[PDB]
Amino acid sequence: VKKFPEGFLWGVATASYQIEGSPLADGAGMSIWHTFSHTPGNVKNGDTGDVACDHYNRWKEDIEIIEKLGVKAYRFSISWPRILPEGTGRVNQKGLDFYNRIIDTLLEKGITPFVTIYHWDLPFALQLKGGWANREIADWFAEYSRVLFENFGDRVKNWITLNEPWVVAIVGHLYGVHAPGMRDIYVAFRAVHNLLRAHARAVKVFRETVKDGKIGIVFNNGYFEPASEKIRAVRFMHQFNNYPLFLNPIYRGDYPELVLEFAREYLPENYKDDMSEIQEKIDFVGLNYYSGHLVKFDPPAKVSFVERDLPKTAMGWEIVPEGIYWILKKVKEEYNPPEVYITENGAAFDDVVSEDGRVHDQNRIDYLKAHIGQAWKAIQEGVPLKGYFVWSLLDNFEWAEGYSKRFGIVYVDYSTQKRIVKDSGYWYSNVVKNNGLE
Numbered sequence: 001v002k003k004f005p006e007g008f009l010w011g012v013a014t015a016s017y018q019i020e021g022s023p024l025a026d027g028a029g030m031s032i033w034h035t036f037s038h039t040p041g042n043v044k045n046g047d048t049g050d051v052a053c054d055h056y057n058r059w060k061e062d063i064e065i066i067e068k069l070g071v072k073a074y075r076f077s078i079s080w081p082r083i084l085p086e087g088t089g090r091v092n093q094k095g096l097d098f099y100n101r102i103i104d105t106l107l108e109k110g111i112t113p114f115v116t117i118y119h120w121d122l123p124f125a126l127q128l129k130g131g132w133a134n135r136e137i138a139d140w141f142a143e144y145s146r147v148l149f150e151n152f153g154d155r156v157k158n159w160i161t162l163n164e165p166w167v168v169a170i171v172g173h174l175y176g177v178h179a180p181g182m183r184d185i186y187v188a189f190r191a192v193h194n195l196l197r198a199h200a201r202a203v204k205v206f207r208e209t210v211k212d213g214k215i216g217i218v219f220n221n222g223y224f225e226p227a228s229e230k231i232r233a234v235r236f237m238h239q240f241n242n243y244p245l246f247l248n249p250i251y252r253g254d255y256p257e258l259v260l261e262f263a264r265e266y267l268p269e270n271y272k273d274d275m276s277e278i279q280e281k282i283d284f285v286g287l288n289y290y291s292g293h294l295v296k297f298d299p300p301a302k303v304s305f306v307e308r309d310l311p312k313t314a315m316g317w318e319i320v321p322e323g324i325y326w327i328l329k330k331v332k333e334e335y336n337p338p339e340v341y342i343t344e345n346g347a348a349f350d351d352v353v354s355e356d357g358r359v360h361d362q363n364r365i366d367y368l369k370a371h372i373g374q375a376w377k378a379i380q381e382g383v384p385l386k387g388y389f390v391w392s393l394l395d396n397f398e399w400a401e402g403y404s405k406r407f408g409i410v411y412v413d414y415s416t417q418k419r420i421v422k423d424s425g426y427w428y429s430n431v432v433k434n435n436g437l438e
């Protein structure tokens with residue numbers, strides 16, 4: 001048996017644009033994912049978030065699912081342009097009303113809300129003004145965050161400023177694969193820096209507004225292993241792609257060494273002037289983790305991936321459970337944050353509904369079990385892991401892959417919007433009830 005600490009938080013996670021649909025309902029402004037997905041060529045099969053899981057209408061049902069599974073926490077994100085349709089200035093009460101009902105329902109049902117303030121759906125109005133490239137977003141983001149805190153801080157006590165700011169910056173502004181779909185390395189590194197400044201301003205405002213809650217920030221992480229003896233390229237990928245790109249500034253007041261070696265020229269000339277403010281104290285670190293990568297030096301960023309003959313998900317991501325134990329050990333050893341959460345872990349598989357009406361995703365069960373086992377290990381060795389969140393409650397719009405990738409522990413038939421709890425969801429409910437494995 002692998003039992004977790006008393007009060008360990010077992011949750012599931014979603015993001016607004018991925019599940020809600022109705023992007024322009026009730027006075028909402030367009031987001032950059034609306035405009036990006038409505039641009040031909042950007043998303044597989046021309047898929048958009050227009051309907052998604054119709055959570056905008058089916059939210060009560062979905063929460064009743066969380067309740068019925070006995071899941072203890074729900075991580076969800078708020079659509080900035082539902083709240084402030086122009087990004088700043090006007091506040092939309094119908095947008096606040098939508099999330100107020102969700103929050104009150106969760107609380108009524110004894111489920112702990114964890115709110116992600118930003119999971120990628122920037123108001124389009126702000127993108128016209130340069131979005132994450134513009135220093136002024138530290139102010140726009142603080143004003144947005146202040147509204148959320150003033151309206152919801154009486155009830156929501158667990159907050160996340162940013163989801164995966166590496167993805168936002170690099171995949172959105174260097175690779176151009178995500179909104180706003182740009183390819184400029186100087187813009188990408190100014191977005192990294194402004195994400196940090198905006199994150200810190202929001203925490204500063206939080207201390208002024210919600211004297212009783214906690215706030216943190218969520219990073220994507222891979223487990224990079226070297227293709228031989230010879231490991232520095234592993235060092236670069238860790239410092240660039242993982243929590244250190246952001247935590248080195250927050251805890252130590254500068255970017256990591258190998259990031260500055262690669263990217264100094266792309267950062268603002270006087271970027272250190274902002275570092276003292278970037279060090280605003282945070283309460284926890286959220287780590288997302290899915291995949292391991294075999295890496296070797298290669299004379300683009302002087303790194304290339306080397307395919308491995310390992311079990312993979314429908315994303316083509318290699319399944320390396322020890323990765324989640326490594327990243328938890330590593331974060332304690334490098335920055336020693338006071339709390340850590342695993343804010344996303346999960347897998348995409350080609351799920352099918354059997355003739356028996358059930359989804360027999362033993363592949364997803366095996367994936368979740370192994371990773372929860374490794375998380376358990378990290379705890380035994382002193383990592384202050386307070387919770388673990390499955391990505392995702394529901395199959396949903398998987399960004400540039402559209403609906404072709406299913407991460408839910410609940411199956412969604414998009415022709416009907418029927419939800420079918422998968423075997424993995426049933427399995428997870430039992431883990432939560434037992435507070436651990438076997």
Ligand SMILES: CCCCCCCCNC(=S)N1[C@@H]2OC[C@H]1[C@@H](O)[C@H](O)[C@H]2O
Nearest residue numbers: 015164167177220344391398399400401
């Ligand atoms: C190239 C395809 C672009 C979008 C397809 C997926 C690639 C990026 N996916 C990433 S980085 N994801 C993280 O966890 C699962 C998946 C996404 O569903 C979630 O919002 C993120 O927090």
Ligand SMILES: [Ca+2]
Nearest residue numbers: 038048049050
């Ligand atoms: Ca549309």
